[PDB]
Symmetry: D3
Subunit: 285 residues, 6 copies
């Protein structure tokens, strides 16, 4: 339920984040305020792009700090059919216009990401796949919370939010430890019983070693689909307890080829790296 996803955001980190965006955008004197004055005003939020609406909590938080209210005519997660009237913002003219840029930028990107995620979720459902579409750690620094939240609204999984969410043995960890077995034993030992271990693998060989050493998840990285499913099928056969994730060169276009009955998770970097922002405007009436 996309409407209840707003509960995920701790209100204290939210305010801090929004604060910093507002200091970033206006550090000193706001001369443009004298142009608008402080008279009460109303603006309409317009969706000019198709996709999924995501980011209301951030949008609200921004305008709240600035003593404006927002009324939403569409719930979080709604399909957007341009040109749609999405919300109304009310408050002192100068405060409205102060929040405009940050609020739109935030909503545009969050919705951009949710849109991409929903497209990918739909494509996978359209190929009869039951697994989880997921984002990667390829997010914008300092903006991770908005991007991970966008993914969730679009129906995708956030994945590990940070390095502390699960112990991820990437190919570089393997090199540094001197081999998969050594890396996964080290990982499994270090990781609290609280955490799962995932291992990035480029071959069936590595994948089997990883599962043998107690990997909870195996990330089959950069396989061609023809090599992927045979590999995944064997892993699940020998190790039904181990989850299989696929990632690497996955696009919305080729996503159905990567879906298969033995792939539990598909994670796509494009959901955050390449997701174009939606066009929104805030017209004062």
């Amino acid at each position: 339920d996309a409407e209840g996803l707003a509960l995920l955001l701790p209100p204290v980190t939210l305010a801090a984040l929004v604060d910093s965006w507002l200091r970033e955008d206006c550090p000193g004197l706001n001369y443009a305020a004298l142009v608008s004055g402080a008279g009460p005003s109303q603006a309409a939020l317009w969706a000019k792009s198709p996709g999924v609406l995501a980011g209301q909590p951030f949008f609200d938080a921004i305008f709240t700090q600035l003593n404006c209210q927002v009324s939403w005519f569409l719930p979080e997660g709604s399909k957007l059919v341009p040109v749609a009237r999405v919300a109304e913002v009310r408050g002192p003219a100068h405060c409205l216009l102060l929040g405009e840029r940050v609020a739109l930028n935030t909503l545009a990107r969050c919705s951009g990401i949710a849109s991409a995620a929903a497209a990918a979720v739909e494509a996978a459902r359209g190929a009869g796949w039951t697994g989880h579409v997921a984002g990667t750690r390829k997010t914008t620094p300092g903006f991770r919370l908005v991007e991970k939240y966008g993914l969730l609204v679009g129906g995708a999984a956030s994945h590990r939010y940070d390095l502390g969410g699960l112990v991820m043995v990437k190919d570089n960890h393997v090199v540094a430890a001197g081999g998969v077995e050594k890396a996964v034993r080290a990982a499994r030992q270090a990781a609290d019983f609280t955490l799962k271990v995932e291992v990035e693998c480029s071959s069936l060989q590595e994948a089997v070693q990883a599962a043998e050493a107690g990997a909870d998840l195996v990330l089959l990285d950069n396989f061609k689909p023809e090599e992927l499913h045979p590999t995944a099928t064997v892993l699940k056969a020998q190790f039904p307890s181990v989850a299989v994730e696929a990632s690497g060169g996955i696009t919305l276009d080729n996503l159905p080829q990567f879906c298969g009955p033995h792939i539990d998770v598909i994670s796509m970097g494009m959901l955050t790296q390449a997701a174009p922002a939606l066009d929104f405007s805030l017209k004062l009436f």
Copy 2:
């Protein structure tokens, strides 16, 4: 000279920014450190996408915080022909791997933007236009510095960095003030003698009123090219002292149609909102 652009970054704001990215990514215990250990290591930075390289100062700042050094084999601004070996990073294995994600994510986006900017700069030069290609204020909150820097490396102009850089009279300021003349007189009166006033205009009528009231720049927003140049030509004729900027629905594809002898600046939201990140990897050897 793209190599000397690193001087633009105040080293103190840089370190603070990099710090926050590193707290964001690992707030607590880093269990994966036990997998790699602290032995000295070396990683190679690989460019897997074409475009322009941008973001070295951020990349360095990240790895310096983590007691690693970086050696660049290509100067800032170099054309990237994949698959190219761009740099070498050296330091304790766990520290290297700690900086990997944030450093790549940063470099990917900064270079993504620089690439897009350079494409647009080339297209405009290819149509014999002498003006400045520019970005907009449509940036990612908290990440503005990296994005504005990327634009510069790609040969585009940053535009107003924040609300304090120049007094911008958008269409909403016009509505709030009750008209262009009122808004621009208010703006000109408020704006320090230090600052320029720019006015967003949707018609030749507004543009002329704006210039008459002392606008330094006039932003012709969302004109079709056929309406734009005639409008621009007249403005320059009556007001040669006033700069003309064009923006709205400009793409790399249609950019040459928007170039003309009386357009001083062309600003494209897609340079920041639609610029796809470049593919980089950091392989430990």
Copy 3:
């Protein structure tokens, strides 16, 4: 309109600033709170110095953080004729007294600067000069916002708020670049199309080179008035598009000598460096 200047202050940076002042002043346990108790109280704000009133937004922001309200009997920018009753502050006694020092210190300095600015603006109007009186970048670190705001209330111009507001080529930039032409070309090529370039000049020669290389403003630094106006007159003649600013050794006393028809801006360091604070007090007159 000095009453509408409060809109210039972004409310978010304001609160952050006020916060830090309040942590600075009471980092730990406030034992004096036990002396006053928390009973509702009222205090009167008294202006004991002549000048201009400036700083209400800061004064309010401080007391709002401390759950007190303020009622102003004079609008921002009012001339102060001591001894005047300027405002009333209401709230829990301990909260009132917690904000007293920071609020007065802030109001005193902001008003001090506004007063000096208004004196300078008046002197210049009294010599029939139409230009802008301005402050300099000679402000107190961390307190820039209050000081630049005070200047505005007193009718002076803030100038570049920071290094990002306009590209300023000082004499040191000239030395480093190897000459005025080199510096101004470098500056002009650097400053975004969105920014103006200003060049600090000590001679007519430099001023002409600067204008020739595309300087938007020329700052005639430390000229004697007798050398200044002839120089300014020529500059305006050859380059009417270029603004002329005068600065250096300008006092309220000698300010009229520096005014002239070809000087657009006069900037005085004394407006911020040497502006004495006004005397204000906050006398508590109530309980329950």
Copy 4:
């Protein structure tokens, strides 16, 4: 010893403070950096005003953050006779020029305050007074550390640095508590055994009540000198253990009238409110080509 006063500054709060000044002054892109370039350079710090030199630690901290070094030709606290060459600063041209404004502004104000303090300390010594000249809590918000340090370099006392340094019963606390005795009892009971209590008094009456209730210090506020010394003399007679501070309408000019054998401290608001900044400049004298 003014040279050893730098030890008072905790290096961690110093760096944080300097950091914020530098973010304040350049939040975004520094276009002027392209004008100077990054070649090594050297600038001379010039004192153009008389007074006392104060603020070296802040000046250094600023330029250290910007990878520049500073060499001082005069120790902290030196008398300044203009026009004097006070220091040299070395580093990349753009980094030098980035620090110039904040560094000068800081040094100018810290020295301004130290100068005023030293003038007041001298005037008091010239009237044979042995007491402490002090500043007040009338400081610039956020800039308290520089200003209190300036006072110290000029030979004045900082007074309570904040509200936690000593428990100060101002006239408003008296009003709120319902009287001096109530306020001072409340205050001392409140105060830890760690802290002194000081009471702001406008009459001899209040002063005696305050001393009787266990005030460690009594601040005789806004007395005319003719009323002050008789009052101070009596207080010291009845209560030799209690320190007497005088404040209110004290100027460098009238300061000697306020000095007397029974006044322990004289605190002047003008040392921080009205101390004009000294004129300093940083003139680059050399730039060299980078490599």
Copy 5:
């Protein structure tokens, strides 16, 4: 009056402190919020340990940030007789549960410290001692404000809150200065007239030198009681203006042996370093 101690806390530093605790505990997405939902709820705060109740301002500040209200059935400083119903917290379910852990942890520790302090204050009153029981600087970094407040609620003195509250000449300062006289003269000079000087002494010799050089307080560190009172008695005789503090190896058990007519202050590092947290729970009943 323990109820009026809440005034000591500057509300601005309080909010900042509480903020940081809340960012610390939930930096990212709060998935558990989906389990509770946002429906209005009510929880009961239960005291499961004996001792003194301390920390209400912090507890409130936490829940106010999270848009919840608190109603207290016991005033700050009340004796706790388990199992007692201490308060009711109301607000959106997810917000309540978000504040639970930080709020309990804070109240547990603040009350833990207040309890220990009150025990020590009682023991000293029970031996007819009129002096001040005090805490030391042996506090948890970043949590000093809660701990010093807890001490106050339990009836103990906070002592110097930080290094700026009074000039403390510890044994290491003596070593560095080259002797007590040199250290105390240096301290007395340096310290503003506004501040008191205290000197940590391990012998009567040092104590006398310290008092002679103008020490306002003398801290008799790690004396056995039999050596302490004779020393204290002499100091007070020669120097009645100088306050005498005792510290070092003082426990609630041996505290009465350290009380004496010439000891003004007794400071116990255990009041904060050994004071077990009280057991509290927050049980949702709607």
Copy 6:
């Protein structure tokens, strides 16, 4: 290996944390600095209590900010036999003395916790138990990182570091959801695929419902040992994939009664809430 545990601490969060402690302790002018002067000095760190040494990274970080160096004569995790000479600190006298209090306080508490943890780990090993001793979320606010690190050095497990480490369904979540099944289904649906779900249970009934609904862990809260092991034995029999944790009223004294072959984790609140600080001193010589 307790010596390699220092790698777990992200150096950026460490410095920030240490910074705040140092601002907390000296916000203004340090008058005591004039008493010591700035002459180079050396101090000896003395352990006056038995237990385990823990906290070196914090101790170092403190003194590094203050331009002092530290030489350790005992590795992190060493048994302390008082009165032992543990380290030497060198630097300017005033800087040494500035760091003294914070450094000792930190080391005392970290070591206090490690000591308690090691005692509990020993007692459990002495009863032939192979499971993990763990801490709880009952930590000091703002000081969590030091306390969780202390636990690790003493050989105990940190447990969930924060609310994002694993989805914990406490008894209050059960009440709010309207029952165990509802809560655990909601939790399992919400938890990312990357997270484990743990459910706090007060009866065998709840425990079985929880396991049936897909709980990865079951926390048997406040059982008497006689009720606990029978319950644990059945759970493991029906559900071997589900981990069993015991907590509530566990002391070092009664810990062996709570150990049993079907208890995987034992978590004790006393390891953090009751662990007395060790006595250390820093004597300047």
